Amino acid sequence: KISPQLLLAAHRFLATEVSQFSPSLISEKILLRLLKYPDVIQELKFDEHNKYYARHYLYTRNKPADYFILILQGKVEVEAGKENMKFETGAFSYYGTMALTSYISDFSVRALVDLQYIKITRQQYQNGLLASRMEN
């Protein structure tokens, strides 16, 4: 289970250091409502026997994805490139930011270790923006 300190810090960092989620674009109370919505936080269990599997890919190469994810915990790698280069990244690295706007994914995000991430859909994002336009 994710601790409240991690969730709140993810709210802070996500609000300030990410373009689409800035408090002017989406109000703070409604960002918390969007994070608190069910299925926004998802946990993945790593299978050691089958390291490469369809479940381990959070983003698949050249296939569509409509949502933005910010990784709170675990270790992950990105396989994207023309040469198929691979980089290792860790907690609080966000992927799929412009997929929220009105997306074939060139980047491949695969789970290296047990990770805990948040998934924010384009529908959730735009609807949350509309609710943010409500006085708040």
Author numbering: 545 to 646, 694 to 727
Copy the relevant paper text.
The Cyclin and CBS domain divalent metal cation transport mediators (CNNMs) are the most recently identified proteins involved in magnesium cation (Mg2+) transport across the cell membranes. The four known members (CNNM1 to CNNM4) encoded in the human genome are integral membrane proteins with strong homology to CorC, a bacterial magnesium/cobalt efflux protein. Structurally, the CNNMs are complex multidomain proteins that consist of four independent domains connected by linkers of different length. The intracellular region is directly attached by a long α-helix (H0) and comprises two distinct domains, a Bateman module and a cyclic nucleotide monophosphate binding-like domain (cNMP domain).
Crystallization of the cNMP binding domain of CNNM4 was only possible using a CNNM4cNMP construct without the C-terminal tail. Our final CNNM4cNMP model was refined to 3.7 Å resolution and shows an overall fold similar to the CNBD domains in, e.g., PKA, cAMP activated exchange proteins, cyclic nucleotide gated (CNG) as well as hyperpolarization activated cyclic nucleotide gated (HCN) channels, and also in proteins containing CNBD homology domains (CNBDH) such as the KCNH voltage-dependent potassium channels. As in these proteins, CNNM4cNMP features a central β-roll surrounded by helical elements at both its N- and the C-terminus. The β-roll contains the so-called phosphate binding cassette (PBC) formed by strand β6, a helix turn (αP), and strand β7. The first striking difference is the unusual length of the loop connecting strands β6 and β7 in the PBC, which is approximately 50 amino acid residues longer than in related proteins. This anomalously long loop, disordered and not visible in our crystal structure, is conserved in the four members of human CNNM family. The second unique feature in CNNM4cNMP is an abrupt turn of the polypeptide chain at residues 601–603 that distorts the otherwise canonical strand β2 and redirects the Y603 side chain towards the interior of the cavity, thus blocking the required space to accommodate a cyclic nucleotide like cAMP or cGMP. Second, the base of the β-roll in CNNM4cNMP is occupied by a network of bulky residues (Y603, Y694, F698) that form a hydrophobic pocket along with residues L602, I613, V620, V622, and V700, which sterically hinders nucleoside binding inside the cavity. An analysis of all interfacing molecules in the CNNM4cNMP crystal structure also suggested homodimeric assemblies, where the intersubunit interface of 617 Å2 is mostly hydrophobic and involves residues E627, M629, F631, Y639, M642, and Y694. Interestingly, mutating the interface residue F631 to alanine yielded mostly monomers, highlighting its relevant role in stabilizing the dimer via π-stacking with its counterpart.
